[PDB]
Design a protein around this nucleic acid. Structure first.
Ligand SMILES: Nc1ncnc2c1ncn2[C@@H]1O[C@H](CSCC[C@H](N)C(=O)O)[C@@H](O)[C@H]1O
Lengths: 39, 6, 18, 190, 361, 28, 65, 44, 167, 7, 134
RNA sequence: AUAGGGUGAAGCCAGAGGAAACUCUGGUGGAGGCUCGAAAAUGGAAUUAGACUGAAGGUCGGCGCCCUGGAGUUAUCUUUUCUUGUUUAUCCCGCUUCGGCCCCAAGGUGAACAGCCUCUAAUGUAGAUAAGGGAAGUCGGGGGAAUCUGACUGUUAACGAGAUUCCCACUGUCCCUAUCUACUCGGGGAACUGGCUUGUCGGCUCUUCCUAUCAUACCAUUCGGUAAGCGUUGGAUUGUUCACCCACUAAUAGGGAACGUGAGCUGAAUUGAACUUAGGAACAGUUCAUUCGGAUAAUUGGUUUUUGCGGCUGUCUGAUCAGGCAUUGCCGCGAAGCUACCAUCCGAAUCUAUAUAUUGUAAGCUGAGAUUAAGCCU
């Protein structure tokens, strides 16, 4: 049985969280080169 | 070749 | 309940349920 | 296509300017055509039976005749031009007559030209029929006007067998008695 | 399609074509050996003797002349006439005949060529089933010419149309050279199936095997060893169209064996998928024993007369019948372990207690 | 100077030119 | 000119009807319908299917001797 | 006996049960027993 | 004998004849040179029959009436049976059940399994001495001597004088 | 005969 | 050329580019079709071959000396159903052909498997080399 | 509000090697930048009982604090169906609401959060099928191998859901289209001929016309005359070009429609063979291909909303029986109809309509049972 919190999150926040995850992955991939990226 | 009208 | 079920079945067998 | 048939409009009437087309069947004949690669051999071919008295609700053998009839129509269809297709009047020439019923000199089966269960969309042939090699313009139940007029026209046709199987499906029997003798005894017939 | 000119194609006219025209080179292909030589340490400058087979109209010869030492011996061999070039000795003769051998020997007085580079190609348009094979044959002939004109540790460069007979050429090259490698320069437009293979370190054997350079058995075909397993389960699978010919020793295209051979064999799957029939002998004692069984009835014999119309449900029955027929026919060590374990546990407990003594600082 | 012209593609011996790929009148 | 019998259902085959398959084994299979041909292609056993004459002769439904 | 197999022949499924009434005009229950797409071939 | 004839401008006398059975054609020139018959509605009589008469199953009942039928895969009886009144060479792979219908010897003409088409005796020029009867060509270099002639020895017009002398 | 087109 | 007599129409079932088995013992395995002799003319229509029709083919699989150039071939088996004037539609297991010369003599010495009746009649050499007919 | 699935970090416990350190194997623990959803050319001056919505109509982790034992059906069967310290962690199995880190919400199935069910004539688009071939179409279409290329180790290294080329397999992309289901033609337009000129970019492919004729006709092949009736192809765009390469064919002739003109792509018959003439021809007699056109469905192949028969998967009618849903749910066959160069029939060269058969042995014996005209016969 699905929990209520899961039901709410999968219908209210799942899409934008996935979009943000994709955008973060794209930013990470596009920044692999570009010498001058130090911690 | 030979035609019909020939 | 079992007696009621048996009586209903017997009535239906004799076509008296209605 | 052909510019000689330029008017693609419907015919004036079903009687193109006489017999009723019944259907088609198949025959096999012993060919005697000297000089041909099929000399002294057997050839199977399509023939059309035209009923010439009909179950409608409304010449000699070894001779070539021409049939005048109205083409079967198919209605409007979209030379890259859209319009009437069919229902044209057409004359088809040099169609050899094969028979003027189904038993040949080689097939000893007392059977009639009518198939098992009759033709499709046409009953049994209860009257005289003209059996013409090939296909004639117009579909079944149409009226066809037969008319008179190469070694082909002089060939003598020796019929060997006529296909009288049911056209109403993949028939395998020539007579109902043959089917009854093949299958045997059924539950109903007891 | 459209029956258009080749010059009207989208990639036929290229920047390499115009670059070769500007540089005076007779073909854009001249750039290919320009880049290949730039990949393998400028091996033309260290050659000093050059042989170029099928060099119409001399683009590679021009490149060699511009790159190799000034007074080198670039010799071009062709089948079509070639426009003469300065400091290049070009002549016309078919390389697949003794005339080419005689002319080359006349021109190769005593020197042995340090490099042989071949760029031959047929008249493409036949169908590519013969074009690729005839190009491979041309490459093998060029190798046969080169093997007798190359010094030890020589370089041989050739162009092969990729096809089924390309790994065979690579293997043959590996048996006569130290390092064999294929490549494709940028000026080798990526729609083309041509690949340029270069091989360095010529072995130059004293007694070379002629049959290693004979096309009669270099291009020998390979047999098949398929499992023949789908023919028992997936009978109505519409097996892949058999367009690979028949067996050499097969004339009737038909096989039959005794049923007892099927019983005694170790591989029933292979025999069921190959035979057309199993023969029954009615005067054999083994078949006399096998006949009086609960099997060998209920449409079994009829399934044996034709092993091509059965299906899985009958093949399994036959296999079960074959199975039926085959069936018918110490304390001190433990104490030491305990002692060492007790010592280890005592040491660990002592260390843990000492550590806990000092974790309230 | 001989090595330079040899690199250009001029066959010369001490200096007279036997054969040059490019003209010597325009060679720098 | 001879009435053959279908390889599958043993029903008569007449000139023109059916399609014949020639195996590489120089064996001719004559069929009376596309039904029999399709049954043969799927490697269906004629004796198992009840409508064929092979089933009827292998179960005593019709005399065979 | 009404042969609804012949009368409804060629009609799309989605309108078989409604149109069936048109070839007749508790019987509505017998018409719609099997839904829109299902009408018995013969009815009494 | 020295007889030269063609069937419709074809030198292969053995293909269309055998002795005598003559193929049915569009003329009577071939028959007059020498039984009009067809085998399965074909003119190749010599390569579809054998005798000193065996016909395959492809022959119709009518043709068999016109002229013993054998049930065996290699329907080209004239190509797999080189026979005379006494000795008959056969195909190596022929079935046993028809050998009882045909002295029968399973042999090849120097590796040629078609004994009835490469041997007529005259055998093809490629025949080795051990298997060898004279090895001689026919119809101007045709190694197929069984089908290129019959043996009277009727042969195609294209036969050269030395070849006819050998025959 | 196909008559030509006169000027 | 080299065919004996006339020919009738058979259902075309082998267009250009098709690959068929090699039924003679010349050392080849398959033949790849590149052209058809006397096919006709029509726009966008691929030339197609039937049994008994001489085509030009190349040996895709076989002895290297055999696949040196394009060569004539004759189709002897057809997988496409075709009509037989005796009154029967028929077809074979697979597409097969035999290598020959422009005059119609095969390079091999025997033919494996059944040979179409129509093909074994146009070409007397095929009838001589064939072991099985129909 | 910060959810869920998987993976399983420190730390802890039990074993083996080793002087330790440490490394292994098992469990536990539940963390994260871990992951997943000459000059031409048109002619010329969803309604009528049925159905639908289907409960999503400071912080974190684990342990401790809805199902089950009156009404409905009953041909047969069913006591049934609905409702009232020993801590898991090292320290001292559901739904709703002690220690590291810094707005409410039912049940059954789902060997997958998912999803499913229930209680309170023509045209166009999409989809499927199709004999033989298998990318022959077009600029260019499930596995294997090798090259080019991008961040970059210790063997032709590896890696990238990067690109290219070959091998095998498959395919309606094509030859060449045909059938079924659901919804549902604008063709066309809007620096001046002063009678010039000739013999010394598949960019327009339902077409029409010109002759300055390539072939066929008449006077082995060369030249020329009448002649426009008729016909003037399939592949490669894969290496090299100054522009072509390879075959079939009777031949694969040259041009105008302003540089043939823009919804798209960079750049009415025709012809060829075969027998005989005739052993390197022909007229006479005779038999057939190719192309084109007209028509037709006997057969062969294809197609199924007869949703005709039979099967299977999931689910629901208390269970068999008989049925419904899942856009033939997925399959096998297939009638009628339509249809195929994939089927058949016919054809001096000049002047009726249209906007018995099929499947396969029924429920409880049996080629049984079911369906058979709506465009079958009777
Ligand atoms: N069998 C053969 N023998 C000799 N030369 C051949 C040949 N086959 C093809 N050739 C020639 O080889 C040439 C290859 S193209 C030349 C490749 C090279 N880039 C260059 O320009 O020199 C073709 O033009 C062809 O004419």
């Amino acid at each position: 049985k699905v929990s209520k919190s899961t039901k709410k999150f999968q219908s209210k926040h799942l899409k934008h969280t996935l979009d943000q995850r994709r955008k973060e992955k794209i930013q990470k991939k596009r920044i692999q080169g570009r010498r001058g990226n130090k911690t | 070749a030979k035609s019909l009208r020939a | 309940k079992y007696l009621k079920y048996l009586t209903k079945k017997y009535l239906k067998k004799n076509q008296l349920r209605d | 296509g052909h510019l000689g048939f330029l008017p693609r409009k419907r015919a004036a009437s079903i009687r193109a300017r006489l017999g009723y087309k019944a259907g088609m069947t198949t025959i096999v004949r012993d060919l005697d055509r000297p000089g041909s690669k099929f000399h002294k051999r057997e050839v199977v071919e399509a023939v059309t039976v035209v009923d010439t008295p009909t179950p409608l609700a409304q010449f000699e053998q070894n001779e070539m005749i021409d049939a005048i009839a109205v083409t079967k129509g198919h209605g409007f269809e979209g030379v890259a031009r859209a319009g009437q297709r069919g229902y044209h009047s057409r004359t088809s020439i040099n169609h050899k007559i094969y028979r003027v019923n189904g038993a040949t000199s080689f097939d000893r089966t007392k059977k009639t030209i009518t198939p098992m269960g009759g033709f499709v969309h046409y009953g049994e042939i209860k009257n005289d029929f003209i059996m013409v090699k090939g296909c004639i313009p117009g579909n079944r139940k149409r009226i066809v006007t037969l008319r008179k007029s190469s070694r082909k026209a002089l060939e003598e046709v020796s019929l060997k067998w006529i296909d009288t199987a049911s056209k109403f499906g993949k028939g395998r029997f020539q007579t109902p008695a043959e089917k009854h003798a093949f299958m045997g005894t059924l539950k109903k017939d007891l | 399609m459209g029956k258009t000119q080749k010059k009207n194609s989208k990639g036929r006219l290229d920047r390499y074509y115009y670059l070769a025209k500007e540089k005076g080179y007779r073909a854009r292909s001249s750039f290919k050996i320009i880049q290949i030589n730039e990949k393998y340490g400028h091996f033309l400058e260290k050659s000093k003797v050059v042989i170029d087979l099928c060099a119409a109209p001399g683009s590679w010869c021009q490149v060699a002349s511009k790159l190799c030492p000034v007074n080198s011996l670039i010799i071009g061999v062709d089948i079509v006439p070639m426009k003469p070039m300065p400091n290049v000795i070009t002549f016309q003769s078919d390389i697949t005949t003794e005339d080419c051998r005689s002319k080359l020997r006349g021109y190769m007085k005593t020197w042995k060529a340090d490099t042989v580079l071949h760029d031959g190609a047929p008249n493409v348009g036949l169908g590519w089933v013969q074009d690729a094979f005839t190009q491979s044959q041309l490459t093998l002939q060029a190798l046969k010419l080169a093997v007798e004109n190359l010094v030890v540790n020589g370089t041989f460069v050739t162009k092969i149309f990729r096809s089924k007979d390309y790994n065979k050429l690579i293997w043959v090259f590996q048996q006569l050279f130290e390092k064999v490698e294929a490549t494709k320069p940028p000026a080798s437009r990526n729609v083309s199936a041509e690949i340029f293979v270069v091989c360095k370190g010529f072995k130059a054997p004293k007694r070379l095997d002629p049959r290693l350079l004979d096309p009669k058995e270099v291009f020998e075909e390979l047999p098949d060893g398929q499992q023949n397993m789908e023919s028992k389960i997936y009978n109505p699978e519409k097996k892949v169209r058999k367009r690979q010919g028949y067996e050499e020793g097969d004339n009737l295209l038909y096989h039959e064996t005794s049923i007892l051979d099927f019983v005694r064999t170790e591989d029933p799957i292979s025999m069921l998928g190959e035979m057309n029939k199993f023969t029954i002998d009615e005067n054999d004692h083994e078949w006399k024993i096998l006949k009086k069984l609960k099997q060998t009835t209920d449409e079994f014999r009829s399934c044996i007369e034709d092993l091509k119309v059965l299906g899985k449900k009958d093949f399994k029955m036959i296999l079960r019948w074959r199975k039926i027929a085959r069936e018918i026919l110490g304390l001190q060590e433990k104490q030491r372990l305990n002692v060492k374990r007790e010592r280890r546990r005592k040491n660990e407990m002592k260390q843990k207690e000492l550590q806990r003594m000092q974790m309230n600082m | 100077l001989a090595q330079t012209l040899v690199n250009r593609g001029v066959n010369l011996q001490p200096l007279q030119i036997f054969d040059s790929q490019v003209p010597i009148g325009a060679t720098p | 000119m001879r009435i053959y019998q279908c390889h599958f259902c043993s029903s008569p085959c007449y000139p023109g009807h059916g399609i014949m398959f020639v195996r590489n084994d120089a064996k001719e299979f004559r069929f009376c319908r596309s039904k029999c041909h399709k049954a043969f292609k799927q490697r269906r056993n004629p004796r198992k299917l009840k409508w064929t004459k092979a089933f009827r002769k292998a179960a005593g439904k019709e005399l065979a001797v | 006996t009404i042969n609804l197999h012949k009368r409804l022949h060629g009609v799309s499924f989605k309108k078989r049960a409604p149109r069936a009434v048109k070839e007749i005009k508790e019987l509505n229950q017998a018409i719609w027993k099997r839904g829109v797409k299902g009408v018995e071939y013969r009815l009494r | 004998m020295a007889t030269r004839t063609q069937f419709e401008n074809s030198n292969e006398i053995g293909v269309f004849s055998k002795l005598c059975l003559v193929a049915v054609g569009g003329s009577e020139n071939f028959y007059s040179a020498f039984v009009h018959t067809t085998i399965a509605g074909t003119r190749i009589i010599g390569r579809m029959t054998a005798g000193n008469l065996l016909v395959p199953t492809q022959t119709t009942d009518q043709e068999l009436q016109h002229l013993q039928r054998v049930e065996e895969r290699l329907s080209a009886l004239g190509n797999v049976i080189c026979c005379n009144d006494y000795v008959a060479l056969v195909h190596p792979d022929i079935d046993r059940e028809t050998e009882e219908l045909i002295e029968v010897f399973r042999q090849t003409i120097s590796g040629n399994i078609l004994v009835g088409s490469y041997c007529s005796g005259l055998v093809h020029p490629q025949t080795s001495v051990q298997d060898q009867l004279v090895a001689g060509t026919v119809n101007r270099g045709s190694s197929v001597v069984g089908a290129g002639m019959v043996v009277l020895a009727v042969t195609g017009l294209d036969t050269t004088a030395p070849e006819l002398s050998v025959i | 005969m196909r008559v030509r087109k006169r000027q | 050329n080299g065919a004996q007599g006339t020919k009738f129409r058979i259902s075309l079932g082998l267009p250009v580019g098709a690959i068929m088995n090699c039924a003679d013992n010349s050392g080849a395995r398959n033949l790849y079709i590149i052209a058809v002799k006397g096919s006709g003319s029509r726009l966008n229509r691929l030339p197609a071959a039937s049994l008994g029709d001489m085509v030009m083919a190349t040996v895709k699989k076989g002895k290297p000396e055999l696949r040196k150039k394009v060569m004539p071939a004759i189709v002897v088996r057809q997988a496409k159903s075709w009509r037989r004037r005796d009154g029967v539609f028929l077809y074979f297991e697979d597409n097969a052909g035999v290598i020959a010369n422009p005059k119609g003599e095969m390079k091999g010495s025997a033919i494996t498997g059944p040979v179409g009746k129509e093909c074994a009649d146009l070409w007397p050499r095929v009838a001589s080399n064939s072991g099985v007919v129909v």
